[PDB]
């Protein structure tokens, strides 16, 4: 009055509803009943004020803006600055606590948080204002940016109780040099994991129990002291079912991993180390896959493992199916072309344009194939039967020449227990054929046992007669077999070099065995002099098949 | 009265521009045009509301309040309560309905959302506010809350005709037990589905038609009564590319995913099925990938392949290129060690730390590398060029010592149609050498027909006289050939045991090809008594080799 | 002026703290000063205008709505329409250089926003509102929208300098049709793009110098004029360490990708290329990851590499380990079938169900696993030690049978420099057996110079008496070796016919060796005619063991 509008509240005044007065503040407030006696400035019954957003409201969707405020809240709403300056920790933890706040702690569009005390998350996930480069131009639109000077932080992590949320996020530690501050702790089952950037601390994602349905994605981890992301598992639970991918670790002192004790069915993939001083460490890794790694000098080591398990026989079943680039100093225990060891092998199936190989922990086998063929560990190669229980023999098949329409003839072979063949085709005449390599038997009456093939020995029946015979239990026989004798030693073991003539004849299995047929037991020799007179080598061999 | 600031609409006042008075609800409005003398309570033209966001500036920005409010639009600009208690579908359709909402429906802040009806969101994509554990607390934190008890949605699916987009979203179906009431159903083609938890529900994903380009991980789906994921695909119009990542599946009464028709080209990979009834089941799986896979316990099945194929022939062309972790019951039909079936093998390439396998579906053949070395599924190994048109011999070579500098020295082998040989080398004198499996060929009186090896046969030509000869069409030759004639069997097919002495003579194939060029069709061999009288045996064996 | 509110500013009147009065526009100021005679119209110093955001509170926060207005700020505080009409390019470039906001550029909740000019991103990443379908339904309710026709975007990219994220969206170029029109220029190092759909453009996503740590998933990329990804990298940094998954290139006139230059240690999965011109195409392609590509029909090209290297022995060291669909004219030089060539290989590792391979880019060795066995490129399948210093032999073991228990019976073979066998056993009696490949040697008179088999040749000491003996340097030795002697050419190469009686003697390496030991230098053959003389033949063969 008069001239300008401002009334203050009058104990001997009847407002009416809908009347309005300033506070001694100067809002104003505006009566909602009638007969209002009630002094605003110490009691607000009866009274709201007219600049508070549930008195205000947006007409296109009938609500107030009291409500419209709900549909995002920050660290913002309790007070933080994100100016690079101010300690936003009390906001920070005042949303965590607040009834308002849903299963997130979010920044604000634009700040620089400076954190200089702990957080407790309270089973809130953390989403950033955007996942930056590692340059200033990024930390000062957006990120938090833990005082690491600070000393209520010192060998503290400072985000504790994390939800299973991390995402869209840049955070930094500054001025935290050997203060061992650490940036956030997680638990290991159910957690999504993805676009951030983290830069310093001592180890930047701290996974508490043990892993499982743990996911980890495009991050960039930058200048750790200790660990990229470490797992103690404390209570050795072990690990399972841990996803880490399109991770750029660079310029840690330490390691980019660190598991304590065991990990097993995890996945590895697109990982990148550069300037690190140690890769992904553990105490086992059982049956994990690992894809593609871009492993690139060391910041002051001199070699280290990309991969490094240190517990006896306790990296096994594992994939090995990505390429391993390494450059500047790192080594790798799991190269397809690496030599095996009697125990101790990084165990597992690698597969890589350097090779195709697979090798267990505890054992010298390993098998590698190259553009050149195969290469043994144990200088042995198997040739067998899937099933376990099938006795068969085997057939190689190889191709040797074409047929008469011009397409690839594979001949055959045979290897029983009997009969060592490789067959052939003339496809001029149309007849199959076959080369041989029969069993050698030799004589010798210096021996002092027979020599045996296979159940047959050579025997001397009676001066000039020799018995090429089964021994007892050998029930295998001939059948139309070829055979050779060979060149008698006359006289003495060194021979005289006097020689003889041979005939043979068989030996039936039953009556008329051979003669109806062609089944033997054996053979004997027959050895005469140049007089038609039987005669008695010292030594002699014999050659035979069992079959045609 | 004076004291105070109320002035209602007075129909005999003008009311210049900027003017202010109460309407009857005591809002306060401003004229906005010069002489006004209409009733703001029964017409607004030439008035504005001073409480509306249109009225309220940022002077930040110079905008208003309105425009800022366009932001970001919830379902909570619609009414939604979010208060676990209060339907809130009539909003979630009313913000699907809006003319001002985007291509997503998004959540507020926080909230428990209650829906008891079936919400259409006419292609909209559904945004939440959060992936969290599956557990109250995040639940009560933000989710959508679907009342299974409804009757509006017994055997219905909750959200219909969603857009390409469900991301950072938890959802329950509360009290549904019994009530096959399924969460949301999208199309097929073009899908990115991130970062879900999903808790209850008969189906939790719906797919409608059938997949491609559809994009599904990061997922949390947790004691679903039928399936995690179902597509019926009742056009059988084939789904594609489809990817399926990240995904754990726990304690549901069905399946992980059922496809009731065909699958071709989709990818799965770092799934989990912790205590389910089934895996992933399909009429047809083709050319699909397959990576890590943890599979651990049965809800109250006793034993489930971890993929189920149901049509004959039908599980074909795939990778199956991640370990398969089997606990508790989980079987499988594409291990690399498992053996192969005549027919409907779970057809593709299998690559893991337990064997490196490869088979098709319709055929007994199963190739396996090992540690070891190799197994076959069908009692063969082929040998051959990549090449079908290639029809040169092999040389396989070997390692069977060292050079004289000690390094390896691998041997060459030949197989040809002629010829059969393991080359050697002594290093000492600087020999190359070999070993050799002749062709055998025995001559026998009593044979219907005779033996042929390779095109050559023996007949006999005059007493003591016999041709080891080339039939009609051998056009093959003998070149430097070596020759071992066999043991005669003299008098019968046993023999008497009288022996008899040989020599030869080779058959040239033109004049002088043996004299000059050691060419040769055959050789003949000669018999004779110790008389030196020609004789005939009644059988005996010949070696010989076609190249020295 | 009694009946309503509304007074201007008087110079002769002194405002009290609090005192409302009117700007001459209509808007209320109040005064927050004491004895205020400030004309608020000319001088706002000591009022506060009441309808700012400033002046507005959420009493649940206890703060201003001008803070909660920094939770969320998008183009649209800077005046952009999104109208499908409207120019926005200024209210773009405005958001990008201002001080308020934070690492990325934010659209609103619903626009369509036309862009006719270029805008500078300043380094801020590109956040859309929402990842839709290819459709006009999408793109009416959130995406860019840039105008192709504007005569200042002709040959040139709409956005420039991006940061590191390009996410949750929608992008089309209308009426550029021979424009020329780029959509964005995002560096090489440091970037997460995911969840885009890119409609029309000449290169849609342009990368500025060389990858590093990009990581590029799930995206929609249709109609490209040239294409999907293009980098140029002028300055050849090489790029390295790309992901490039869940990619729908579709109906593009050009390429998926296109690298001028070189890629190496890049990932790329879950791509599909339907009806595209041609897929990705670089000059170098080094260890790189390729997983599953689905490459169905051609634009209008009638033929189509999936992958196209263009440089000489340029691709290599790759992993080509998913399943590549080809239909309707795309075709592959990846495949493991696929023959080698001596050069230019696509080298690397091949997995899939078409099978196992393995080459390197500049020679013909190509190994190949399916099912029935192997196939060489080269005509050569080596077998040897992983060590390179390994010099012994292998043994090769093989299933002949069952043993007495009826367990699978794998039998030794032997191939060394002087030995080869192939061993078995008789389960019945209980004694190994063995086959045999002798050495053969063929003494010939009229051979220029001696036949020698592994140091060992054949000579005339006098009538009759040959030795099969050691030539200079050959230190090896015979040990209890199996002799057989062949067949003997009289009087002539062809021979006579005749025939002669043979015996040996053993040449011992010291006094002794033979008679006690059984180890020999070699041995003499001696032949005898009918009458028991000594005779020479013209030519003969010998067949011998260096072991039992």
Same mark, same amino acid.
């Given at each position: #009055?008069? #001239?300008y509008?401002?009334?203050?509240?009058?104990?001997?005044?009847?407002?009416?509803?809908?009347?309005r007065? /300033?506070?001694?503040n100067?809002?104003?407030?505006?009566?909602?009943?009638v007969?209002?006696?009630?002094?605003?400035?110490?009691?607000?019954?009866g009274?709201?004020?007219?600049?508070?957003?549930?008195?205000?409201?947006?007409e296109?969707?009938?609500?107030?803006?009291?409500?419209?405020?709900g549909?995002?809240?920050?660290?913002d709403?309790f007070?933080?600055?994100?100016?690079?300056?101010?300690?936003?920790?009390?906001?920070?933890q005042?949303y965590?606590?607040?009834?308002?706040?849903?299963?997130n702690?979010?920044?604000?569009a634009?700040g620089?948080?400076?954190?200089?005390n #702990?957080?407790?998350l309270?089973?809130?996930?953390?989403?950033?204002?955007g996942?930056?480069?590692?340059?200033?131009?990024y930390?000062?639109?957006?990120?938090?940016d833990v005082?690491?000077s600070?000393p209520?932080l010192?060998?503290?992590?400072?985000?504790?109780n994390?939800?299973?949320?991390i995402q869209?996020?840049?955070?930094?530690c500054?001025?935290?040099?050997?203060?061992?501050?650490?940036?956030?702790?997680?638990?290991?089952?159910?957690?999504?994991?993805?676009?951030?950037?983290?830069?310093?601390?001592?180890?930047?994602?701290?996974?508490?129990?043990?892993?499982?349905?743990?996911?980890f994605?495009?991050? $960039?981890?930058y200048?750790?002291?200790n660990?990229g992301?470490?797992?103690?598992?404390?209570?050795?639970?072990?690990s399972?079912?841990?996803?880490?991918?399109?991770?750029?670790? #660079?310029?840690?002192?330490?390691?980019?991993?660190?598991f304590?004790r065991?990990?097993?069915?995890?996945? +590895?993939?697109?990982?990148?180390?550069?300037?690190?001083?140690?890769?992904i460490?553990?105490?086992?890794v059982?049956?994990?896959?690992?894809?593609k790694?871009?492993?690139?000098?060391?910041?002051?080591?001199?070699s280290?493992?990309?991969?490094?398990?240190?517990g006896?026989?306790?990296?096994?079943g594992?994939?090995?199916?990505?390429?391993?680039?390494?450059?500047?100093?790192?080594?790798?225990?799991?190269?397809p072309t690496?030599?095996?060891?009697?125990?101790?092998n990084?165990?597992?199936?690698?597969?890589?344009?350097?090779?195709?190989?697979?090798?267990?922990?505890?054992?010298?086998?390993? /098998?590698? /194939?190259?553009?050149?063929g195969?290469?043994?560990?144990?200088?042995?190669?198997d040739?067998?039967?899937?099933?376990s229980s099938?006795?068969?023999?085997?057939?190689?098949?190889?191709?040797?020449g074409?047929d008469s329409?011009?397409?690839?003839?594979?001949?055959?072979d045979?290897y029983?227990?009997?009969?060592?063949? $490789?067959?052939?085709?003339n496809?001029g005449?149309?007849n199959?054929?076959?080369?041989?390599?029969?069993?050698?038997?030799?004589?010798?009456?210096?021996?002092?046992?027979?020599?045996?093939?296979?159940?047959?020995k050579?025997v001397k029946?009676?001066?000039?007669?020799?018995?090429?015979?089964?021994?007892?239990?050998?029930?295998?026989?001939?059948?139309?077999?070829?055979?050779?004798?060979?060149?008698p030693?006359?006289?003495?073991?060194?021979?005289?070099?006097?020689?003889?003539?041979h005939?043979?004849?068989?030996?039936?299995?039953?009556?008329?065995?051979?003669?109806?047929?062609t089944?033997?037991a054996?053979?004997?020799?027959?050895?005469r002099?140049?007089?038609?007179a039987?005669?008695?080598?010292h030594?002699?061999?014999?050659? +035979?098949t069992?079959?045609?």
């Open positions: #009055q008069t #001239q509008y401002l009334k203050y509240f009058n104990p001997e005044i009847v407002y009416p509803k809908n009347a007065i /300033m506070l001694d100067g809002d104003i407030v505006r009566s909602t009943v007969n209002n006696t009630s002094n605003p400035n110490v009691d607000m019954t009274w709201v004020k007219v600049s508070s957003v549930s008195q205000i409201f947006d296109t969707y009938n609500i107030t803006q009291s409500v419209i405020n549909n995002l809240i920050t660290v709403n007070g933080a600055k994100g100016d690079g300056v101010t300690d936003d920790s009390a906001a920070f005042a965590c606590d607040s009834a308002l706040t849903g299963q702690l979010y920044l604000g634009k620089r948080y400076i954190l200089k #702990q957080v407790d309270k089973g809130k996930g953390l989403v950033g204002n996942c930056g480069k590692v340059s200033e131009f930390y000062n639109l957006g990120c938090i005082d690491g600070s209520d010192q060998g503290k992590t400072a985000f504790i994390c939800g299973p949320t869209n996020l840049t955070a930094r500054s001025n935290g040099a050997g203060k061992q501050v650490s940036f956030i702790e997680i638990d290991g089952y159910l957690a999504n994991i993805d676009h951030i950037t983290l830069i310093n601390f001592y180890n930047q994602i701290v996974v508490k129990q043990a892993l499982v349905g743990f996911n994605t495009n991050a $960039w981890l200048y750790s002291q660990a992301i470490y797992c103690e598992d404390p209570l050795n639970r072990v399972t079912t841990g996803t880490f991918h399109n991770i750029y670790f #660079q310029l840690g002192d330490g390691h980019a991993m660190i304590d065991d990990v097993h069915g995890c996945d +590895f993939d697109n990982i990148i180390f550069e300037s690190m001083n140690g890769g460490k553990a105490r086992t059982a049956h994990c896959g690992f894809g790694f871009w492993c690139e000098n060391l910041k002051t080591a001199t280290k493992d990309w991969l490094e398990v240190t006896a026989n306790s990296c096994y594992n994939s090995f199916t990505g390429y391993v680039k390494l450059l500047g100093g790192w080594t790798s225990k799991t190269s690496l030599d095996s060891l009697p125990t101790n990084y165990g597992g199936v690698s597969v890589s344009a350097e090779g195709i190989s697979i090798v267990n922990a505890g054992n010298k086998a390993k /098998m590698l /194939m190259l553009p050149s195969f290469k043994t560990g144990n200088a042995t190669i040739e067998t039967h899937i099933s099938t006795v068969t023999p085997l057939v190689k098949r190889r191709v040797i074409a329409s011009g397409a690839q003839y594979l001949a055959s045979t029983t227990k009997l009969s060592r063949k $490789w067959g052939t085709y496809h005449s149309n199959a054929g076959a080369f041989y390599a029969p069993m050698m038997l030799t004589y010798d009456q210096s021996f002092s046992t027979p020599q045996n093939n296979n159940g047959w050579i029946e009676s001066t000039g007669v020799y018995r090429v015979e089964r021994v007892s239990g050998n029930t295998s026989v001939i059948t139309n077999g070829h055979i050779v004798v060979g060149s030693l006359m006289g003495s073991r060194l021979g005289t070099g006097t020689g003889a003539t005939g043979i004849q068989m030996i039936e299995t039953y009556a008329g065995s051979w003669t109806s047929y089944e033997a054996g053979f004997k020799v027959f050895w002099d140049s007089s038609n039987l005669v008695d080598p030594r002699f061999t014999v050659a +035979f069992a079959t045609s």
